[PDB]
Design an enzyme around this catalytic site. Sequence first.
Site: not given
Ligand code: CA
Lengths: 588, 588
Positions: A154, A182, A255, A342, A344, A373, A438-439, A487
């Site tokens: 952050n 961020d 999507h 990348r 998805d 992916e 992350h998966d 995560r």
């Molecule tokens: Ca922030």
Amino acid sequence: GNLAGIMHRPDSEMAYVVNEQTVNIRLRTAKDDIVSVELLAGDPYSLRSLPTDEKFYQVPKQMTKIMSDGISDFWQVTVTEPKRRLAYAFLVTDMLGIQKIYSDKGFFKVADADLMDMNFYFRMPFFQTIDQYNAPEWVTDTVWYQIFPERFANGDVSNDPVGTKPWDSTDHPGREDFYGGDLQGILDHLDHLQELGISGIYLNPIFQAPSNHKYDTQDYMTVDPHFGDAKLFKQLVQAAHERGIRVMLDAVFNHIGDKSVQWQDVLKNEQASPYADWFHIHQFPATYTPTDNFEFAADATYDTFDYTPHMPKLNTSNPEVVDYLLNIATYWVKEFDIDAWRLDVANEIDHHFWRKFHDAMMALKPDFYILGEIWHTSQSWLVGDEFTAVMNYSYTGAILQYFLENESADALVQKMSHQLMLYRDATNRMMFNTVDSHDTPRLMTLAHEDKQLAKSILTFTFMQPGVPSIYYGTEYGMTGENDPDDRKPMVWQPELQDHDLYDFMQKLVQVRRQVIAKLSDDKIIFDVIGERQIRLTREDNQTRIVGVFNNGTTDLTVAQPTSILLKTNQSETQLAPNDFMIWTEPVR
Amino acid sequence: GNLAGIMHRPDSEMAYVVNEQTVNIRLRTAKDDIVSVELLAGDPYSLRSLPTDEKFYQVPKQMTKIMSDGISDFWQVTVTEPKRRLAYAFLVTDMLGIQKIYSDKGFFKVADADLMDMNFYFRMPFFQTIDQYNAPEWVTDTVWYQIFPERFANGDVSNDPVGTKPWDSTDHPGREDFYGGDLQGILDHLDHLQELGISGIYLNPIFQAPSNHKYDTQDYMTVDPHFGDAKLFKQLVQAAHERGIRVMLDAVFNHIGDKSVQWQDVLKNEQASPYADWFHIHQFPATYTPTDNFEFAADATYDTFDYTPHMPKLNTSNPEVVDYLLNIATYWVKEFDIDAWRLDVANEIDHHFWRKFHDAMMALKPDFYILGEIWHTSQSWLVGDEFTAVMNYSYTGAILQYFLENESADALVQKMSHQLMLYRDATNRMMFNTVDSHDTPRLMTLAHEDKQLAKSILTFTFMQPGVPSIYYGTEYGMTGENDPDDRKPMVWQPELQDHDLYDFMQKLVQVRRQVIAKLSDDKIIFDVIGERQIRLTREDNQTRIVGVFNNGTTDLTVAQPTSILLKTNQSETQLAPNDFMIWTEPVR
Ligand SMILES: [Ca+2]
Ligand SMILES: [Ca+2]
């Protein structure tokens, strides 16, 4: 011999152009059934058009057995032909000494083969570099680092989502939690990435979307305002590039999210929406019955990612959707100079679109990197006209299975060999190897917090042909079960960081970039030297890198290497269970 | 079982989309090694996303062994899936009863297979009709007739080349002879084509060029003036269409003739020519050393068709050449309404070009027919994005080999089965079957003027899945060795015509168009019923057409058919050597 086990597919990964005058040709045979293979090859027209008595089939070329996957053997040869046209056939001899010629017309005794007829042969009709696979050279020297931006740092509390939680790397995050990570936080920690030695960043989605993961896109043309803005993203890309770090963004084109302007217009206007045919709507109004799981509906009247009603599938066959997506893809490259996309859920979008995407990206940047992916075999996207590579989950998944369970070393080597022989040699070098993401569950959790085992898995993966990636926090030993627990907020508190693992990962990255990436057109060899003992060799014409991995339950003695690069035991000769040792030696 | 003989290649002719919800899946096994194959298949996401206890792998689908090529067996099944996403694996059981599951991850005992993991399976990720193969329905009802225009009919002496010879079908033409055939002569004999029953004309090249064959193009945008002009060609196409006859022209895009404006500019200006990069010039000036054979030079400094210095190869990777050729391709379709392009030496032009060509043609005419001239395996051009079909010389060549030599019937059936299993089912129906052409010896000469044998070859070919073509003059028994002797002036003198063969070909064309073409999604079966005795069956759900071919040296007795369609013996039960009998029977 085993005729049903022999196969050559022309115009494929078994017969492909390497440069204007050079092709690679492969043959599959049944494992250990064929003792030798020679290639008969030359210009098809030479047989009857040239006045010479010499014919190309009179001087065979020896093929080399390069790999086996436990079922088949794979043979390869490189052929140069100045006329850029090739007819070829295979002389195969089995264990009993039975020799036949195998060609496009089938199997024959030599004496029965019509060797003067160009149409007897398999054909590479003209060597077409426009159709060939090209690997971007810069990827060779890359070690990637994957940032899930909500959770890396952050750098600005003022853009935090409502309900943002205190930054605590020991939390078990829920599916809808926010911690405020961020783009300013990434910028703030570029020094950490440079000190670790990475040279590429892969960002999960950063465009406007309501969730913490942002795969339910609201607007592809806007940086999510909780992450930053266009000016800040440009600053980040320029700062990364100034450090020698390339940038890959996540394209979520299968999507769109249900809060997008386009889907909301469908909900308002039904089939009269200008966007109705941008989707796959079976019945209007577009509806679903909610369930207690926000990510599941049983009866949505439109196609979706998985069964989530919040991710309506885009109709990428619609020219208006093609134009929209290509304009997005072009915008971020042209305006911000990103280096890669990348893709998805890339397998669920049509090849026609990906060819147009490829052409558009290469027109902007001939060395662009396109990473799909896909978790299953990906041959049809890796010919040279669509992606550069895929996220190589079948390969790293086999590695994890070996180290974490009790498979034989033979089984692992067979699986990796099968994988490599699916693809062109250069494609294998472009594959993106990440042990976790992350998966998935985190490496350190899959390893039950056995650091030595985690180091072995990472080192073995970093020695493979593909380019490696480090999921954020791996270098400090972060734990986590699968999504959302994979995560956690990045660990910036030193008391919670594994400093020994960080030092080790620095050394491993250096071995990859300074040694492994600098061999010249190397050959990789997998040797099973004992029960769960593997010797991995990569070698060029001057230098051989050897890694020995002892993953049995007994000690292993090796000859003392002169030039050890990396090891885990204090001994220069003894490997305890789960130790490894990497060394370098001259080729003689 | 023979594991090395088992293979499934996803996203190929073994796994392809038939319509929005339907796919065809094939498996290869070693011949007679696998007793049964079941498919486990369903939506990948259903396994873990749906709350039901039911799982797709609990209800296998039986696959059917459809063909064998003597080495492998080929199994097929059609699958419907409303979610338009498919994960699948194969349950294979060998002769000893050993059953395994075969998937993208390899071979497993059922109990060891991770059937709940969608990534265990092979994948059809989303059914993409934009990527699928489409067969134009009109081709189904077509019988083609191929006209080499210099030799079909002289309808206008006033456009004849200097030195035109008297029209004599008994001549042995030389390579550079002219007889004056032209477009008016074709127009003059459309009645003959309609009486024979043909419904498509394939013309050899008609654009301006100095030779009698016109594959050395001077100007693609002009009808050769010895053949006619634009007004006359339009009249011909309209007259053909009025009779129900479609028109296919010959596109000679691999190379241009050396008297073209573009090549002559290269000869004048060397590398400063605006056309230098339209070719493949290794050294300037573009030169060669002439030989006593005008069609051969050993040392041309540019790539050519074969080794002829008069046909410099076009660089179809150059965008200016792409634009030039696509504008030619578009012009003849848009301005003259032709129905198809036959692509000369199509394999030596790159796939990138053929995709652009395909897209341009389908944008003009969604039912356009694109026919590639390729004499070897053609899988990579027949996916659905490039050609419709090829000239099926490997298939008709196998037929000729059987009838003209002493091969076993088993060998022929194996070769035809191999061919069919290279391609999607609909592709096999689009293949262009001609027993001879302007590039082969004539059928009647290969048959040593044995009319019965010629009739057997024609009938057997006309029963195959592909669409048949009649090279001009076949219907009257014209003779000829290979090019140039296969290009005799058409026989219009009745004293020189085989009227019995003409009557027979009328009957055979009618069996093809009225019976064979009107079955509904038929199955073809090749049965070897004795030494050089074949029973060919095509059948739909109501009607079965059977052809028995006796090509041994003994008589063959068959049951008297109720409904004989075509036969050569006077007997309704006896077939002498080289007789055949075709009949129809209801399916019970
Ligand atoms: Ca922030
Ligand atoms: Ca004339």
